[PDB]
Structure 1
Amino acid sequence: EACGYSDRVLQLTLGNSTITTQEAANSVVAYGRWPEYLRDSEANPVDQPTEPDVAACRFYTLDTVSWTKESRGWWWKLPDALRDMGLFGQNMYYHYLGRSGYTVHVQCNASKFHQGALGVFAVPEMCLAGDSNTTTMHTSYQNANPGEKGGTFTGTFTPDNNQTSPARRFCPVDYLLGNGTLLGNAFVFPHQIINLRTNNCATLVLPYVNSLSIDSMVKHNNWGIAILPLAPLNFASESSPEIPITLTIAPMCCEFNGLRNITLPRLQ
């Protein structure tokens, strides 16, 4: 717009929450599909669904992590990461079934004198590799689901050797996308790159993806949010620089079925 409007400057508003950004590289809509409610033609569960709307379909800001020369990368799972977030987590646990889209806004600012590139990826059914070489598909429910704090990637695969009392957890190696495939190709998946010299953040609008119209949000995680350093953090001359990466996410057009007593998971 000769009037002023621009790709880099956006304003997102959901329920009682609003996000502003003066340095964005536009925004991405996974597979060109904007989140939507379950249609009658595609519906399964016959009971009147619970649609929290503004109470849950708003912006939740998770615990801010620190990016450094040493960082190999971070990972999160949806809905798992939002499981303890206000009215959204409450409605998710009270219902047998649930479906939801997301507006993922990854925030990470610095300075015209800093360097680095964060590869922000949205992966459908992001199944990760375990820490065991004597057994398989053994990663425990508690460890597979870190909740809000999420997990992290490792530059090296080090097998759990304690056969007696197994760590029973994931060993996601960075260059292999934590799942047996080459990172260089992760780009076939809905994503955006946070290149310090070009932009403050990454905005990904994710639709409800799955082999089913609606499923068990507590048993199954539809989307995986992977953040890896394509180009290592670097500043002026400081040998050990640091910058925060804040992750804010908002559930969308989300709905729930099969209402009963609240589900109290064994998360530890």
Structure 2
Amino acid sequence: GYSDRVQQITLGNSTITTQEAANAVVCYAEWPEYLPDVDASDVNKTSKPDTSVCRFYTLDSKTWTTGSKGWCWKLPDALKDMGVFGQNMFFHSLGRSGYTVHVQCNATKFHSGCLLVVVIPEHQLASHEGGNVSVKYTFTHPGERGIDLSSANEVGGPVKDVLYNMNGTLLGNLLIFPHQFINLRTNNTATIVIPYINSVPIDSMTRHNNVSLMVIPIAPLTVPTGATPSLPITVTIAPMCTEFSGIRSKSIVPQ
């Protein structure tokens, strides 16, 4: 009586149940694991807070309306302030982590709409100015708020044009990245497990984000007659196999 459909994920002191899942994606078919010695470089023993950092943090909720263009969060940024995960983050020189991402959106059998939930490794954004204008730090570190693709261009911020993925590629091809759809008629959640993907064994958690999670409405939300025209979307994310190394004074970052 197991269905692909019902699932439970327990991680730390927190549990999620979905009764309307559509399997789960594990990026590149690899599950998060700690850093092996053969791959290690820094000689420091690392710190593995385990259950105090590897639990589920639910970010603040978004509201899908008929005019929504899509939202974008960066990792580990989105979690920069969650509990002890965040403290560890500002206090060590280097850290590394994988995540379980669970995006939630329920409706009824009269609604229609379909969101794309995708994880993009190394999502370098484009400046809407063109040329070689850079995208300032603050703009690519929105924190739990994430970036709202239907917000206005700002100065020093990225471009927010959806048919171009914020980088000069077409929305249609985002499907080459680990992703899952939430089609109100099928699905009510999306779950993706992200292994740590980098060109170095461990890195800085503040100067470099290693994935952007993106939720994009593709088939517009259509509510039943005289229904309220909107649904909330909630994102809950859990660091998994986290390791921190090179402890010290506590980083100070712009803004």
Task: Give TM-score scaled by structure 1 length.
Answer: 0.92
Match for 1:141 among 137, 144, 166? 137
SS of alignment partner, residue 112 of structure 2: strand
| 1:21 alignment partner in structure 2 | 18
Alignment of 1:114-125 (within 5 A): 114-125=111-122
Which amino acid in 1 is paired with 2:49?
Answer: P
CA deviations 1:174-203 (Å, max 9, x no partner) are: 011111001101000000000000011100
SS of alignment partner, residue 26 of structure 1: coil
Inter-partner Cα distance in structure 2 for 1:129 and 1:238: 40
Q: Which has the larger radius of gyration?
A: 1
| 1:231 alignment partner in structure 2 | 219
Match for 1:150 among 125, 136, 146? 146
| 2:170 alignment partner in structure 1 | 182
* Structure 1: gaps of 5 or more residues: 161-166
Shift of 1:26: 0.7
Alignment of 1:54-133 (within 5 A): 54-133=51-130
Shift of 1:159: 6.9
User: 4+ residue runs of structure 1 moved beyond 3 angstroms?
Assistant: none
| 1:254 alignment partner in structure 2 | 242
| 1:218 alignment partner in structure 2 | 206
Which amino acid in 1 is paired with 2:127?
Answer: G
| 1:163 alignment partner in structure 2 | none
Q: Is the 8 A contact 1:68 1:240 kept in 2?
A: no
Closer, same or farther in 2 for the Cα pair 1:214/1:137, shift >3 Å?
Answer: farther
Shift of 1:239: 8.3
Which amino acid in 2 is paired with 1:145?
Answer: H
Give the alignment's Cα RMSD to 1 decimal: 1.5
| 1:201 alignment partner in structure 2 | 189
CA deviations 1:200-228 (Å, max 9, x no partner) are: 11000000001111101100000110111
SS of alignment partner, residue 186 of structure 1: helix
Which amino acid in 2 is paired with 1:218?
Answer: T
SS of alignment partner, residue 6 of structure 1: coil
Closer, same or farther in 2 for the Cα pair 1:193/1:95, shift >3 Å?
Answer: same
SS of alignment partner, residue 91 of structure 1: helix
Shift of 1:120: 0.5
Closer, same or farther in 2 for the Cα pair 1:69/1:239, shift >3 Å?
Answer: farther
Q: Is the 8 A contact 1:77 1:225 kept in 2?
A: yes
Shift of 1:143: 1.3
Aligned length: 255
Q: Is the 8 A contact 2:100 2:193 kept in 1?
A: yes
| 1:44 alignment partner in structure 2 | 41
Inter-partner Cα distance in structure 2 for 1:184 and 1:131: 20
SS of alignment partner, residue 33 of structure 2: coil
Inter-partner Cα distance in structure 1 for 2:8 and 2:148: 30
Q: Is the 8 A contact 1:132 1:159 kept in 2?
A: no
Task: Give TM-score scaled by structure 2 length.
Answer: 0.97
Shift of 1:139: 1.2
Aligned-pair identity in percent equals 55
